[PDB]
Amino acid sequence: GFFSFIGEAFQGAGDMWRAYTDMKEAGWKDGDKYFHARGNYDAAQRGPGGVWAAEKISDARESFQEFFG
Amino acid sequence: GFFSFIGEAFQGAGDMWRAYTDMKEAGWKDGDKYFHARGNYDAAQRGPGGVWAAEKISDARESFQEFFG
Amino acid sequence: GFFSFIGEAFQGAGDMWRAYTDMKEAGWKDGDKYFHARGNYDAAQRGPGGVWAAEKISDARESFQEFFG
Amino acid sequence: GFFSFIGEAFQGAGDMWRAYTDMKEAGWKDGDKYFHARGNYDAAQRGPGGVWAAEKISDARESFQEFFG
Amino acid sequence: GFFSFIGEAFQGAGDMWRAYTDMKEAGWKDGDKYFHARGNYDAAQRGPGGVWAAEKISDARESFQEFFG
Amino acid sequence: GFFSFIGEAFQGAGDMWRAYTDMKEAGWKDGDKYFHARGNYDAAQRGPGGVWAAEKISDARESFQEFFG
Amino acid sequence: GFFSFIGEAFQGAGDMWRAYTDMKEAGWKDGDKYFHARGNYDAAQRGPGGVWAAEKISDARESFQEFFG
Amino acid sequence: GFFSFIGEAFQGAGDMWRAYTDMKEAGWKDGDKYFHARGNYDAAQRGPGGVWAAEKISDARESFQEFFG
Amino acid sequence: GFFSFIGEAFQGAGDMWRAYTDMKEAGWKDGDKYFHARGNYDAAQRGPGGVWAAEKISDARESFQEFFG
Amino acid sequence: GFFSFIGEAFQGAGDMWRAYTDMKEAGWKDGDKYFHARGNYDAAQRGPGGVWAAEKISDARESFQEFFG
Amino acid sequence: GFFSFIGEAFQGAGDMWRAYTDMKEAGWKDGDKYFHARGNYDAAQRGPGGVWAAEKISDARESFQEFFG
Amino acid sequence: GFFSFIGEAFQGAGDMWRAYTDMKEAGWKDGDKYFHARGNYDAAQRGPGGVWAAEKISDARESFQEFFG
Amino acid sequence: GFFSFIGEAFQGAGDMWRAYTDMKEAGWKDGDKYFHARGNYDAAQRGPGGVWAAEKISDARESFQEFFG
Amino acid sequence: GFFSFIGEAFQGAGDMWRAYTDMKEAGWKDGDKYFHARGNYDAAQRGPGGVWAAEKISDARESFQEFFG
Amino acid sequence: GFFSFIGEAFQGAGDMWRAYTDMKEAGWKDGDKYFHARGNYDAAQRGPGGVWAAEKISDARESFQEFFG
Amino acid sequence: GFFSFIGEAFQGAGDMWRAYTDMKEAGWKDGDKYFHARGNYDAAQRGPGGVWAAEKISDARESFQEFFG
Amino acid sequence: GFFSFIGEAFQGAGDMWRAYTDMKEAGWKDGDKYFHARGNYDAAQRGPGGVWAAEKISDARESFQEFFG
Amino acid sequence: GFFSFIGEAFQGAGDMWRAYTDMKEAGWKDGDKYFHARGNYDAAQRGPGGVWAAEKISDARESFQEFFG
């Protein structure tokens, strides 16, 4: 099994990027969540990029190349 | 089993990047979560990049290359 | 089993990067979490980069190279 | 089993980078957590880099190279 | 078993980098945690670098090289 | 078993880098934790570097090299 | 740039399987060659086979098999 | 740049399997060659086989097999 | 740049399997070669086999097998 | 840059398996070569085998096997 | 840069397996060579085998095996 | 740069297995060579075997095995 | 190859009358050349003469004569 | 190879009359060359003469004569 | 190889009349060369003469004569 | 190899009349060369003469004569 | 190898008439060379003469004569 | 090897007429050389003469004669 959580350039309150497995006879309660923003500038940004998501990669040659300037 | 949590350039309150496994007869309670922002500048940023996520990578040659300037 | 938590350039209150395994007859309570920001500049930043996440990497040649200037 | 927690360039209150395993008949309580920021500059930053996360790396040749200028 | 906690360039209050294993009939209480910042400059920073996290590395040749200028 | 805690360039209050193992019939209480900063400059910094974390390294040749200038 | 010479189940006299390269200001003579056979039985024989000649073979998968039953 | 010479199950007299290179201001003579066979039985024989000649073979997987039953 | 000479199950007189290189101002002669066979039984024989000739072989996996039953 | 000479199950007279290099102002002669066989039984024989000739072999895995039953 | 000479199960007279290098202002002669066989039984024999010739072999894993049953 | 000479199960007269190097202003002669066999039984024999010739072998793991049952 | 370089009454910096033959895998560089001449009288002078270039001159009778005066 | 370098009444810096033969894997560099001439009289002078270049001159009778005066 | 370097009445700095043969894996450098001439009379002078370059001169009768005066 | 270096009435700094043969794995350097000439009379002078370059001169009769006066 | 270095009426600094043969794994350096000439009369002078360069001179009759006066 | 170094009427600093043969694993250095000449008359002078360079001179009759006066 493969579990991968990735996060970048974000504003959150709570409860994020959670993994629960192999459980029995459990129980849980979560809390209220409030987000309040006033007068904020130049926030929550990421620059250019690429995203690749896969299970198997086999015999990659001269690939997955990225160039900027 | 593979569990990978990654975080960069973020503003949070709580409860993030959590892994629970192999549990029995458990119980839990979480708390309220508040996020308040006023008058903030140049926040929560990441620059250019790339993301690769996979289980198996086999025989990679001259690849996964990144260039900036 | 492989568990990897990574964090960089962040502002948080609590409860982050948690791993719970192999448990029985347990119980727990968490606390409220507040985040308050006013008048803050040039915060929560990371520069250019790359992210690679995987389980197995086999026979990598002239790869996973990064260049800046 | 492999457990790896890494943190860099962050501002936190508490409860971070926690590992609990092989437990029975346990119980615990956590405390409230407050984060307050006013008038702060040039905070919570990391420069360019790369991140690699994996379980097995086999026969790596002329790879995982990083250059800056 | 392998447990590795690493921290650099951070401002915290408490409860960080904790490992609990092989426990029975235990119980514990944690305390409230407050973080307060006003008028602070050039704080919580790390320079360029790289991060590698893995379980096994086998036959690495001319790799994991980093250059700066 | 391998337990490794590393810390550099940080400002903390308490309760950090803790390892508890092989316990029975134990109990403990922790104290409140406060962090207060006003008017501080050029604090909590680390320069360029690299991080490698692993369990086994086998037959490394001309690798794990770092150069600065 | 290679020279391959393979011979099986032949009846010869001489002057066979020559590779001459990088000759300058040379000179020579080869004599005479007599072959005489009288009354021979069941000679110069080979069984079944598969013959392959090439310069470059890439990424072959589940191929070049021979079965005899 | 190599020279391979392979011979099996041959009846010869001489002057076979020569590799001459980098010769200058040379000179020579080879005599005469007589082959005479009378009344021979069951000579010069080889069984089944597979023959492969090449310069470069890359990333071969589950190939070049021979089965005899 | 190598020279390989392999011979099995041959009846010869002489002047075989020569590798001459880097010759200058040389000179020579080779005599005569007589082969005579009368009444021979069951000579010059080899069994089944697989023959491979090459210069470079890379990353071979589960290949070049021979089975005899 | 090497020279390999291998011989098995041969009936010869002489003048075989020569490697001459780096010769200057040389000179020579080789005599005559007589081969005579009468009434020989069951000579010059080899059993099954697999023959491989190469210069470079890299990262071979589970290969070059011979089975006889 | 080496010279390998291997011989098994041969009937010869002489003048075999020579390696001459770095010769200057040389000179020589080799006599005559007679081979005579009459009435010989069951000579010049070798059993099954696998033959390998190479210059460089790298990172071989679970290979070059011989089984006889 | 070495010279290896190996011989087993041969019937010879003489003039075998010579390694001459670094010769200057030399000169010589070799006589004649007679081989005579009449009525010999069951001579010049070797059993099964595996033959390997090389210059460099690196990082061999679980290989070059011989089994006889 | 015949090479006849002949020079009379000439002035140069360098790189004159060069003969390169039978070269391999060789590289070379020739620096820059300056020729400065000022205030010089009666330079680079050859008297009268005849010039002959040929390969084969057979049965020349009373020919190729130069009568001065 | 025949090389005849001949020079009379010449002025140079260097790099003249060079003959390179039978070279391999060789590299070389030739520095820069300066030739400065000022205020010089009666330089680089050769009297009268005839020039002959050939290879074969057979049965020359009363030829190739130079009568001065 | 025949090399005839001949020089008469010449002025130089260096690097003249060089013959290189039969070289391998060799590298070399030649420094820079300066030739400065000022205020000099009657330099680099050769009287009259004839020049002969050849290889074979057969049955020369009363030829190749130089009669001065 | 025949080498005839001949020099008459010449002025130099160095590096003249050099013959290199049969070299391996050798490297060398030649420093820089200066030739400064000022105020000099009657230098580098050779009287009259004839020049002969050849290899074979057969049955020369009353030839190759120089009659001065 | 025959080497004839001959020099008459010459002026130099050094590095003249050198013969290197049959060298291996050798390295060398030659320092810089200065040749300064001022105010000198009647230098580097050779009278009349003839020059002969050859290899084989057979049956010379009344030839190769120099009659002065 | 035959070496004939001959010198007449010459002026030098050093490094003249050197013959190196059959050397291995040797390294050497030659210092710098200065040649300064001022105010000198009648130097480096040789009278008339003939020059002969050869290898084989057979049946010379009344030849190679120099008649002065």
Residue numbers in the entry:
A (entry chain Q), B (entry chain N), C (entry chain K), D (entry chain H), E (entry chain E), F (entry chain B), ...: 1 to 69
Question: What's the publication's text?
Answer:
SAA1.1 is an acute phase protein that becomes strongly upregulated during inflammation. Chronic inflammatory conditions, such as tuberculosis, leprosy and rheumatoid arthritis, are risk factors for the development of systemic AA amyloidosis. We report three cryo-EM structures of SAA1.1-derived amyloid fibrils: one that was extracted from the diseased murine tissue and two that were formed from murine SAA1.1 protein in vitro. In vitro and ex vivo fibrils possess parallel cross-β sheets but differ in their overall topologies and fibril protein folds.
The second most abundant fibril morphology (morphology II) represents the majority of the remaining fibrils. Morphology II presents a left-hand twist as demonstrated by platinum side shadowing and transmission electron microscopy (TEM). Using cryo-electron microscopy (cryo-EM) we obtained the structure of morphology II, complementing our previous structure of morphology I22. The 3D map of morphology II achieved a spatial resolution of 3.5 Å, based on the 0.143 Fourier shell correlation (FSC) criterion. Morphology II is polar, C1 symmetrical and consists of three protofilaments (PFs). The PFs are referred to as PF-A, PF-B, and PF-C. The arrangement of PF-A and B in our model is relatively symmetrical and similar to morphology I. The PF-PF interface is formed in both cases by reciprocal ion pairs between residues Asp59 and Arg61. The interactions between PF-B and C also involve complementary charged residues. There are reciprocal interactions between Asp22 and Lys24, as well as a contact of Gly1 (α-amino group) from PF-C with Glu25 (side chain) in PF-B. That is, the packing between PF-B and PF-C is more asymmetrical than that of PF-A and PF-B. Alignment of the fibril proteins reveals only small, if any, conformational differences between the protein folds that construct fibril morphologies I and II.
